[PDB]
Amino acid sequence: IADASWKVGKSETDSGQTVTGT
Amino acid sequence: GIALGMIETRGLVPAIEAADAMTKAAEVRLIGREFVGGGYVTVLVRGETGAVNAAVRAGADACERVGDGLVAAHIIARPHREVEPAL
Amino acid sequence: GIALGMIETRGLVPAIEAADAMTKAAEVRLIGREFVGGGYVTVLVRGETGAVNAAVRAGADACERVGDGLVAAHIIARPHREVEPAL
Amino acid sequence: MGIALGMIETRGLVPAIEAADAMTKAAEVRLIGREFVGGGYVTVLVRGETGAVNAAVRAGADACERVGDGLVAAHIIARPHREVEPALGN
Amino acid sequence: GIALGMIETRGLVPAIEAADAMTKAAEVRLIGREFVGGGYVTVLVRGETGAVNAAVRAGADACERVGDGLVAAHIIARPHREVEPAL
Amino acid sequence: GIALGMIETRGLVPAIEAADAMTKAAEVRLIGREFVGGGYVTVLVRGETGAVNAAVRAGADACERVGDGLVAAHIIARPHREVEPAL
Amino acid sequence: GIALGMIETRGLVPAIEAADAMTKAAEVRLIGREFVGGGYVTVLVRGETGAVNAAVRAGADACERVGDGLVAAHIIARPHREVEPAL
Amino acid sequence: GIALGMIETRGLVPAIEAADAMTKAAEVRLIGREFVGGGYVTVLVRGETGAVNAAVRAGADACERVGDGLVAAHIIARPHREVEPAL
Amino acid sequence: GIALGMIETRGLVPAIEAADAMTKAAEVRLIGREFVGGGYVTVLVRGETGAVNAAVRAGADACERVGDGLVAAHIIARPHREVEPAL
Amino acid sequence: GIALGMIETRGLVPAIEAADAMTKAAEVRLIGREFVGGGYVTVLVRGETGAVNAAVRAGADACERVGDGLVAAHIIARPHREVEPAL
Amino acid sequence: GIALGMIETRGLVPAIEAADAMTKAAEVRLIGREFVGGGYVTVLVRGETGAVNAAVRAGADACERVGDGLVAAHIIARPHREVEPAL
Amino acid sequence: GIALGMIETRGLVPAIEAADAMTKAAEVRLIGREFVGGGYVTVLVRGETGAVNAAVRAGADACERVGDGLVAAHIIARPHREVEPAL
Amino acid sequence: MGIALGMIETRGLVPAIEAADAMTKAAEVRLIGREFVGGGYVTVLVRGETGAVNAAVRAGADACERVGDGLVAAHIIARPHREVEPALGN
Amino acid sequence: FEKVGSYDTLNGNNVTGTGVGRSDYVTGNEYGSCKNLTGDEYIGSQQYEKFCGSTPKPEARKVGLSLSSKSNLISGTMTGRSKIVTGDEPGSCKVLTGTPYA
């Protein structure tokens, strides 16, 4: 996963999941 | 343009983020998404050679680390008129 | 659409690419591009709270590698109604 | 007529004008903006075909890297939004 | 596409097969085949800068090992108005 | 002749004495005296390319020791007509 | 008199007192005041050679204490007529 | 009146507070507000020599540590008539 | 102009490279393109002496290692009236 | 300005060198162009005293090093009413 | 061009061979052949600055080994209108 | 008058520079410029025997190091009339 | 009809005259002029074809190197430019 | 004399021409001509080493020499990843099977 910019990298919410979404 | 950029991946999160890379990188319209089968899903986009190249670069960079990741990508520049019915 | 987002860059083109990141990140209405003087350039957008939050987060992430880079990036949720006539 | 956007931003006007010269002598581009940001930041903004803009901005950045105070930013723009266009001269 | 690509090689064989590489790689027009002399043959194409780039790449990739092979392959992205008489 | 030369400096003292060096050193006409901003002053002259060389070299030689002196000395041998709108 | 005397300084406290020195050391007409940018301020006066010399010497003597100080102080015995649009 | 008093300062808060000190201490009328460029802010007041002197001294003493400080502060005792266009 | 700039090389590629360099670098009008034999190709251009020098040097510099290389270049300011029939 | 300045040169190259220096420096009217003989050449200009002084100083200090040098450099402040037949 | 080249030498023979070098080196026109007196001879040519510079270089380089040698050699690129009566 | 002078090189660039040397060196008229083939080039001049000697000698022996170089030079005072078709 | 220029310099007129005499005794060169440079310098000018100019100039040189002060400069123009003679006085 | 004069370009090219360079001879153009920060300088290097002692580094090398994926020398501008041109970094290390472009 490249620079955040276009796509968020590994922004967790509660427990473990990457949930990068959009 | 008529150049054919196109991406292969496993899952629709990578498919639609690759589409977003298509539509945010360069002036390229997608001619269609396709459910290849067995989990394989592809996107087919039309635009100028440099445009489709920038688009595919963006898709590849934003795709490989999403879900299963990118499976294939290819950069047809002059699709012959005989291939249009196949798309 | 009332939440106002705003950012400086130590240069014009970092601001321009910041606005590009704004519009490619979430739905934003870039209302203003202003020359501070001496090189600082401001851009200000409108949108929803979370929308502008994510947009400016992406912009700051994509800005530091552009020229001199980011200098200031913080956002407000509830803008004061009298400020925009001065903006 | 390509809406691909390219820039050169420089510390001073001499590298800006040299970069614009390289823009026109390198690939097909239309110059839309020459703007004095202030305090020596000078921006030249051109439009054209994506590959043409890429090659032009690359050649310009290579040419003006030293001239005067030198280059500061060579940040190619992928594609401006329809909404970005009014802010860059409409 | 006013960008000019062009490839010169030893012998007409690599020249014209590289010309086919031109025409099947991207959008180009084979605007001239020229006999430099002593076996040197040149092919000229016009098209988009990215299209010209991809074309000449494919042409070299075809013409390396054709007969005695390639000697020189090059691009002029934006030729001036005084070079058109060179054809 | 439409060849171009142009000079950058701090403030107008070296700028105008370099302009005098232009106008006493070679048969050139100054088309631009631009206040770039923040002490950035540019003077741009048109003439024949050898005259441009002689003028700008004399101006650089008479300019660097006046106040803060020279910042940049450049010549544009062939100004593109696409660049002329910037002038 | 067409001889060009002119002073550069930081801010206009020294600039206007330099104009004071111009107009008392000699009866030389002041042709302009210019705000260069970045704090640089220039005063342009015209007169005969001796009057310009006396005025510029007085101004240079007077500016050494005021504010940050004087930047550059030299004389133009005769500007070239092509230099006229420097106004 | 013919006495011109005038202050240069870094920023505007010292400038405006000095102007208020001018109007409160001596009967001097503000005849100029100037943005030199780069943030240098200048105030011009007109009045009698003694009033100008006292006001300038008081304002400079009360202005030195205000915010980011004062730059230059002096008094033009006997301004010339041709300095009037330099207002 | 009357001066004759002129370059020659192995194969047509560096020939048009030098031609494009000259027509971009000087006030020069391309007038002659000669296929000599054995791959020798000569490009000869007409313009003023300074322009001829600048164009020749720029083309030779930008054409150094590309292709099979130059063999020479020269700056002639005046061929005789009887030399132009040779072109 | 009736003040007469004049330069004596060993030969003709420094003569017109100094004459060009005169006519580029300040207000001078070249009235005398005398080839005395034996290598002595005189240039004689008329104008204001200070202009003449500055001009001759600059011209001599420029032209001493060219050729075999200058001979005499001083100023006639008030030429008399019958020196004109010698002018 | 109105650039004035001019060469002084030991007698007439180096002057004539220098004029030969003038007319065979670059585009210049002999405006003057002057016998100063005492063995000095000067040649006066006009043309474009670069052309005249190359021509006078060639003329010197010819004259050093001819006769008694060179005396003086100068390049005036901007002859003032006041210099015209001297030529 | 009818003396035939000859210059021969590989590549016409030393050939034509030898030709310029011919028309700048002695009273000889060039009557032919022939492409031998394989890059060999020839210039064919006519003039007086001593003139042919001086010209050809100077030009050929000066242009040997010009690029890939001159190959041979030769002189004929009288070609036979029957050798006319070669002319 | 020879247009090549054979022309030399002497300190004093005695070497000039005797050198010109050798010049016109050694080849068919038309004596087109004598000029007084100033300070005793005298330049003699003749026209002829290249070989005659060479031979006659050589002869005048080795005859005049001793006479009076002697030779100053001996030179041979083979291609007088069209503009030179009008500036030379034709 | 030798009208043919060898002059070395700022990059290192031999051009035989006439040139415009400096010499101890004809004056009026010396004036310390050494300062050199100009694009497209046709001023010869020989002037710089003989009369100034400071050799600048060349320009106008618009030809960008790249290596085609099959390891052969292409050039002519170039459209890859420039170290100073930014905003094109992502994707630099990805495979693009098909019509070669980088």
PDB file of C-alpha atoms in Angstrom, chain F residues 1-4 46-50 77-79, chain I residues 22-28 48-51 54:
ATOM      1  CA  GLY F   1      16.352  39.868 -34.391  1.00  0.00           C
ATOM      2  CA  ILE F   2      14.025  38.236 -31.851  1.00  0.00           C
ATOM      3  CA  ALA F   3      16.623  36.598 -29.596  1.00  0.00           C
ATOM      4  CA  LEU F   4      16.104  37.242 -25.890  1.00  0.00           C
ATOM      5  CA  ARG F  46      15.403  41.529 -27.296  1.00  0.00           C
ATOM      6  CA  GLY F  47      17.979  41.640 -30.058  1.00  0.00           C
ATOM      7  CA  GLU F  48      20.382  39.553 -32.069  1.00  0.00           C
ATOM      8  CA  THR F  49      21.772  36.526 -30.247  1.00  0.00           C
ATOM      9  CA  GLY F  50      25.422  37.614 -30.388  1.00  0.00           C
ATOM     10  CA  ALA F  77      18.077  32.369 -28.095  1.00  0.00           C
ATOM     11  CA  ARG F  78      14.748  31.355 -29.682  1.00  0.00           C
ATOM     12  CA  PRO F  79      11.718  32.536 -27.688  1.00  0.00           C
TER      13      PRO F  79
ATOM     14  CA  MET I  22      19.487  24.254 -34.578  1.00  0.00           C
ATOM     15  CA  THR I  23      15.967  25.321 -35.536  1.00  0.00           C
ATOM     16  CA  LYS I  24      15.156  25.503 -31.815  1.00  0.00           C
ATOM     17  CA  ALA I  25      18.358  27.250 -30.718  1.00  0.00           C
ATOM     18  CA  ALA I  26      18.979  30.041 -33.222  1.00  0.00           C
ATOM     19  CA  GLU I  27      17.527  32.449 -35.776  1.00  0.00           C
ATOM     20  CA  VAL I  28      18.263  29.935 -38.515  1.00  0.00           C
ATOM     21  CA  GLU I  48      23.301  35.239 -38.946  1.00  0.00           C
ATOM     22  CA  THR I  49      26.807  34.527 -37.694  1.00  0.00           C
ATOM     23  CA  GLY I  50      25.979  34.500 -33.993  1.00  0.00           C
ATOM     24  CA  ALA I  51      22.866  32.441 -34.660  1.00  0.00           C
ATOM     25  CA  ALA I  54      24.809  29.059 -31.395  1.00  0.00           C
TER      26      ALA I  54
END
